[PDB]
Symmetry: C4
């Protein structure tokens, strides 16, 4: 679907903005939103520097969701390119 | 195959649950199952924070399997999206 | 497009060369261009060792761009292979 | 090509075996082949724990090659799955 990419992008961007909020109050290593927002991208982009790591179960559970959405993001981006640069081959 | 995604998912989820078990008794850095379960996801999602790292050969051998299944997981997810959002183009 | 891969590659390679320049003068952990060039690849390849990590907001903003281009690079490489080894199936 | 996957796999596996050899004698953090072989996989699988990091230019140049082959490995695996589970859709 044409709105399929937009629907997955709006929910992914929403998480990378909302998930850092509880992470400030539940994690000791996370002491502010800019720090939490940074970690969320580092995790959702499947880069994982390790400079900010969740310790608490809830924090490690929320991190797991961000990783699962992180790999889904790559799959959504790769599909938006693989299906885009393949239709130009016949005509 | 329709059951092809399910067959790869049930064996992948099984490993992320079973592989953390020997990792507790063989690794010094891993001292419990929740810690081991956390590392398994961090590795299988190809994020790799480095907060928990295998030292022993067996632990580094089991980690290699988890990484090889980790990249295969992305390939399985990307294929389940690339082939899903391409069939809607003609009809 | 045939020049589509070249257009994305020339802008990606340009960033991995230009982005390390401000990173030397804005980050304390980055004290030279070879160090900065190394970090840029580690980030753009979505490997993320964590040996060099941005602290400053601007440095963490520039890093985010490099990560977003990093995942786009994998998507560009995977599409240049998935569409290349699929056209040889019928003829 | 049918032998296309085999040709890319035999050269990739060869590097993950040969590249760790100079890395022992050129890097201070790498003091043995099993340690070097471990780092090569961690890098070629684009996991990057950061437990073993190259310092020297040559070591950081060889690491860059391993990362470039690492992302190419994912692209080779994803293509071997995306084109495999798509031909079963019509017949
Ligand atoms: C892009 C901007 C995102 C907001 C974060 C910010 O710029 O960082 C502020 C920091 O707290 C300042 O000391
Ligand atoms: C939209 C982006 C909002 C940017 C404002 C972030 C902020 O709080 O400002 C930082 C300031 O430089 C420090 O006090
Ligand atoms: C599914 C996600 C499950 C991820 C595991 C969460 C629990 C956790 O790892 O617990 C941390 C604690 O500090 C150690 O006992
Ligand atoms: C389903 C996901 C929600 C699972 C919530 C996990 C909560 C948990 O196990 O955390 C323990 C806490 O520290 C003590 O009550
Ligand atoms: C999702 C839940 C997975 C189980 C792990 C757990 O919640 O962590 C318990 C920890 O040991 C409590 O101190
Ligand atoms: C299914 C998930 C099972 C969740 C139970 C995990 C656990 O052992 O409980 C932790 C408790 O909060 C500490 O004693
Ligand atoms: C194939 C997987 C092979 C991975 C390498 C396992 C051996 C290992 O790295 O050994 C650790 C030891 O501490 C150092 O001599
Ligand atoms: C095939 C995979 C199985 C390979 C098992 C490796 C065992 C090993 O080399 O570990 C040494 C141990 O510490 C001493 O006996
Ligand atoms: C490939 C070459 C890229 C340039 C970087 C370099 O070789 O490193 C020099 C270092 O500063 C020497 O001490
Ligand atoms: C084109 C690549 C340029 C390589 C030259 C990098 C450099 O500055 O040279 C390092 C020298 O070994 C130390 O003084
Ligand atoms: C979109 C990119 C936004 C990435 C976040 C940049 C801001 C940052 O994380 O700020 C660092 C500071 O040290 C902590 O307050
Ligand atoms: C749009 C991207 C550009 C956003 C620039 C962010 C600048 C910023 O928030 O940094 C604060 C600085 O430390 C104090 O003025
Ligand atoms: C799979 C086996 C790869 C060889 C590495 C090995 O088993 O590790 C030996 C270590 O040096 C023992 O102390
Ligand atoms: C083929 C795999 C070769 C496995 C042998 C690795 C090794 O050197 O053996 C380790 C031994 O346990 C320690 O002395
Ligand atoms: C293309 C690969 C280029 C990667 C950069 C290699 C040079 C390097 O980073 O140099 C290290 C030294 O310790 C710092 O001056
Ligand atoms: C082309 C790849 C080969 C580039 C080789 C780089 C060598 C280099 O710059 O390293 C400096 C050394 O430390 C001093 O001579
Ligand atoms: K990765
Ligand atoms: K990583
Ligand atoms: K990492």
């Amino acid at each position: 679907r044409s709105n399929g990419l937009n629907r997955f992008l709006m929910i992914f961007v929403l998480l990378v903005i909302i998930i850092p909020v509880p992470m400030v109050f539940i994690e000791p290593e996370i002491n502010n939103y800019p720090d939490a927002l940074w970690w969320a991208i580092v995790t959702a982009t499947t880069v994982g520097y390790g400079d900010i790591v969740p310790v608490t179960p809830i924090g490690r559970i929320l991190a797991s969701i961000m990783m699962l959405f992180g790999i889904a993001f790559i799959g959504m981006i790769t599909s938006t390119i693989t299906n885009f640069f393949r239709c130009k081959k016949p005509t």
